[PDB]
Design a protein around this ligand. Structure first.
Ligand SMILES: N[C@@H](Cn1cc(Br)c(=O)n(Cc2ccsc2C(=O)O)c1=O)C(=O)O
Ligand SMILES: N[C@@H](Cn1cc(Br)c(=O)n(Cc2ccsc2C(=O)O)c1=O)C(=O)O
Ligand SMILES: [Cl-]
Lengths: 251, 251
């Protein structure tokens, strides 16, 4: 059984290779998740076929309980695995299984170097330095749902300054950080990737929340626990570190 | 079925309550893991009986493949769950199952405030500031097994300065940090706990490795995936944050 692996284009996890050489099938792609998948294939001993999710979505539910994206591909048995920056969440575990996480990440702060600002508390208690998140993303939604007082005050500031404080996308937010007195709230993984590529930029404070990326499978898949085992081996033998360093480290 | 829960005394996860009031059974204990267990019990709907692991060990293997500690209790079906600061590891997954992690942690650096030192690379390339780990602990073993060049150089320094660089326990290491020009390599969780209680002390840099604490069960336990689900709900609804803050925050 050649496993069908659903995935999604997302730098640096999954990209098309910058080549016009005759590359076919899996060889068309590169990235952290391609390297991970290769390692998993060699530990477990499976053949695989990478297929980009047709609708280009991660996977969310509508009011009728209908799913889309990579999650739908798993539910429909049109993919055996989902290998992507795919968050292990309560709602998704209702409908698919996940390996244990190959990466753990949390919301943090992207800001300039050389300022007395050291935490989210430092931003919360002032208004001179503006801060926000990508509109309608996971990070904005976190602040919107939070009952923690300091993040409620932070959401109050973001929501009241809606037009300016919230950006269209991560690229816009980084530009806002680079050009204006602005701090962007974004996933730690993304901050690490950006700060490696922008020496004027830095992470501020630690993680504001916590979640993991895991390999998705249909409910009951006999590959799930095997993939957990392989992930633990890669973790312990320093290979996940090596793969992260390969893709994250800047000039 | 009242579940037997194996655990281990370890501040602030599991402690005896500072009380001479008539407290029996589970009520004798307090701590992060007791709070977690209470939440799990209320989500899943189980009764439970907390029993300290008789040998006071986490769980390791001998040459005959014989286990001890909480892992042995699970293998022997003398406990249904292990709820403790118990690391999810490749070797343990061979013999027990684990929920997804309720806490994610990594080796980091404990040092004084106000120095130009900002990372492990800063320590590695000098000898004036001495650094090390607890002798024969997980953190020392990491550096001993690492193939990463900067941690090989760090291990070289720790091993050559064996007598002084390596400490007997965490308490000794903290005292060495407080009294000498010394940086201690220790788990991020422990650093957070200590820095909340010592205003002169701080964390240096980020995580050097990554691992998770999970709830242990016997292989095939029908509680494992339910506990994962409960953990995800607690994570997403900010309750794990609240429980960590309850036990970690200092004066
Ligand atoms: N992990 C998410 C999708 N995903 C993937 C990546 Br990579 C990522 O950086 N993010 C974060 C993100 C994307 C758009 S806004 C935003 C945010 O953190 O605010 C994400 O939500 C999921 O599983 O749905
Ligand atoms: N998690 C470990 C046991 N354990 C528990 C806690 Br709390 C802890 O801080 N550590 C770290 C530790 C303990 C003695 S030395 C050391 C270290 O990090 O070097 C640990 O190994 C296991 O599961 O065996
Ligand atoms: Cl699992």
């Amino acid at each position: 059984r050649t496993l069908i692996v659903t995935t999604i284009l997302e730098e640096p996890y999954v990209m098309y290779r910058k080549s016009d050489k005759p590359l076919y099938g899996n060889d068309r792609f590169e990235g952290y998740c391609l390297d991970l998948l290769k390692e998993l294939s060699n530990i477990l001993g499976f053949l695989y076929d990478v297929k980009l999710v047709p609708d280009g979505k991660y996977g969310a539910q509508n009011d009728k309980g209908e799913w889309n994206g990579m999650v739908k591909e798993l539910i429909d048995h049109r993919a055996d695995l989902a290998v992507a920056p795919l968050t292990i969440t309560y709602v998704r575990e209702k409908v698919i299984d996940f390996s244990k996480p190959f990466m753990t990440l949390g919301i943090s702060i992207l800001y300039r170097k050389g300022t007395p600002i050291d935490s989210a508390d430092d931003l919360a208690k002032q208004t001179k330095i503006e801060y926000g998140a990508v509109r309608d993303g996971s990070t904005m939604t976190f602040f919107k749902k939070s009952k923690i007082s300091t993040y409620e005050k932070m959401w109050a500031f973001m929501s009241s300054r809606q037009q300016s404080a919230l950006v269209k996308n991560s690229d816009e937010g980084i530009q806002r950080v680079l050009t204006t007195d602005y701090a962007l709230l974004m996933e730690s993984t993304s901050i690490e990737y950006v700060t490696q590529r922008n020496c004027n930029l830095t992470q501020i404070g630690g993680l504001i929340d916590s979640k993991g990326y895991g390999v998705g499978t249909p409910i009951g898949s006999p590959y799930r626990d095997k993939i957990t085992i392989a992930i633990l081996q890669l973790q312990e033998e320093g290979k996940l570190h090596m793969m992260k360093e390969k893709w994250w480290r800047g000039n």
